Design a protein around this ligand. Structure first.
Ligand SMILES: O=c1[nH]c([C@@H]2CCCN2)nc2c1oc1ccc(Cl)cc12
Ligand SMILES: [Cl-]
Ligand SMILES: [Zn+2]
Ligand SMILES: [Zn+2]
Lengths: 344, 102
């Protein structure tokens, strides 16, 4: 009923859709868009299912166009979603893309073989390698933005609506998307004083989703790279290996950081953060967990190839969840990792 | 204490500060810090109004903002030329029906 009214208002907002698509259901929603399943007829092909993405009408034109440019320039290959057409009336923009029938990550998580986990990660890295080659930092890598069809072995990374460009990005439009402080003696202690409390706040990029943000995002590092997407891929992999999703459950950035420190260790996180300009102080030290023991204890070692997960899986996970973004594995490197033996 | 903005953080806490000491630290104080719960059944986690970019304006209610003079002006402006220029390169390949006449 609510979806029914949403659909009616979508045809009203972009009337050309009424003469092309039968809008059937809402299939996804985020902060910046809603996605609908529709049917259409092709001029020179069969009937096709189509995903219609309605962008929030507060989106700046440059942000809308940059998303389209990601889809046209980088998409349509290597497990990256492409674009068929786009319809605009005033501030209402609808992107039409091929529909891929896809699994619920939560529903299939504990009904996946270990080999299907390998194939899923391989195909995620193909998509990330592709977008990173164009200097796209996706920022919102997570299962709901990585469509997976198990039976067809088809995959699609979606949603460039939060992307940022690297300094040398090939997506031109991403380059254009939107009381002096004193030192004090509280530094690296549990103290507060009027000097440090009265400083302006640091602003750094953080568009994304709770539980998938890398430590350098959570701690407001101004210089973020494609490595943040590799962290997010590591979080997906952690969910696959542990059987837990969402793995992290945090309503604010520092709670998310505290959860990461319970997994990867406070001393380890503190040491890595110092390399990117951040001092972290914890009141109580928390040890790093062994990744194999953590995942197997959370998943329950059982049938599926899951009684004999190779060391290479947890080694790759350690490299994706590298607390230091400079050393964190890249997508091109991940495809060469021995975890993927017997697949190339 | 609070009156003089001076003291020590009640534990437990996490404190993050830029190393050059140019920005306000940010803090986390919780009654209970995170604990890895292995007993909760999988797939549960082991840890178990907005802004308009066009108008450069915070709003209290989205639908009222979409009706503001500022936003309607923008929505009908030539500011979407950058979008239209990309759309003009795409190929429309769907069947388009005439509007149905009652
Ligand atoms: O950009 C997308 N975002 C999203 C989600 C929903 C809105 C936030 N990201 N889903 C899709 C998106 O593109 C799609 C193309 C086909 C299909 Cl089946 C689904 C999608
Ligand atoms: Cl002290
Ligand atoms: Zn101070
Ligand atoms: Zn506006």
């Amino acid at each position: 009923a609510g979806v029914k009214k949403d659909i009616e208002k979508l045809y009203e907002a972009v009337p050309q859709l009424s003469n092309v698509f039968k809008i059937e259901d809402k299939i996804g929603e985020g902060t910046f868009s809603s996605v609908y399943l529709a049917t259409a007829q092709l001029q020179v092909g069969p009937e096709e299912k189509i995903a219609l993405k309605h962008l929030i009408p507060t989106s700046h034109p440059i942000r809308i166009a940059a998303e389209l440019q990601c889809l046209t320039v980088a998409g349509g290959q290597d497990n990256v979603m492409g674009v068929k057409y786009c319809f605009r009336k005033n501030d209402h923009v609808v992107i039409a893309m091929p529909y891929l029938e896809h699994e619920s990550f939560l529903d299939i998580l504990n009904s996946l073989s270990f080999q299907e986990v390998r194939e899923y990660m391989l195909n995620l890295f193909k998509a990330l390698k592709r977008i990173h080659q164009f200097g796209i930092v996706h920022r919102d890598v997570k299962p709901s933005n990585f469509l997976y069809n198990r039976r067809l072995k088809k995959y699609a990374l979606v949603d460039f609506g939060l992307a940022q460009g690297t300094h040398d990005t090939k997506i031109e439009l991403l380059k254009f998307v939107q009381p002096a402080s004193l030192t004090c003696d509280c530094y690296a202690t549990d103290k507060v004083c009027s000097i440090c409390l009265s400083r302006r706040q640091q602003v750094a990029p953080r568009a994304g989703t709770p539980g998938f943000r890398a430590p350098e995002v959570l701690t407001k590092c101004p210089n973020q790279t494609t490595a943040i997407d590799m962290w997010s891929a590591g979080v997906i992999f952690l969910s696959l290996l542990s059987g837990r999703y969402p793995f992290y459950k945090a309503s604010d950035d520092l709670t998310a950081l505290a959860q990461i420190m319970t997994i990867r260790g406070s001393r380890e996180t503190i040491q890595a953060a110092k390399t990117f300009g951040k001092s972290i102080l914890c009141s109580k030290e928390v040890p790093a967990q062994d990744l194999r023991k953590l995942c197997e204890r959370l998943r329950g070692a059982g049938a599926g190839g899951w009684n004999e997960v190779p060391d290479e899986a947890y080694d790759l996970l350690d490299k994706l969840l590298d607390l230091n973004p400079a050393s964190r594995i890249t997508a091109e490197e991940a495809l060469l990792h021995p975890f993927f033996k017997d697949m190339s | 204490g609070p009156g003089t903005r001076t003291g020590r953080l009640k534990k437990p806490f996490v404190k993050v500060e830029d190393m050059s000491q140019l920005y306000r630290p940010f803090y986390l104080q919780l009654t209970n810090m995170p604990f890895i719960n292995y007993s909760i059944q999988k797939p549960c986690s082991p840890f178990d109004k907005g802004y308009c970019e066009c108008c450069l304006q915070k709003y209290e209610d989205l639908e009222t903002h979409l009706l503001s003079e500022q936003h309607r002006n923008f929505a009908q402006s030539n500011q979407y030329q950058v979008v239209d220029d990309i759309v003009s390169k795409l190929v429309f390949d769907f069947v388009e029906y005439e509007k149905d006449t009652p």
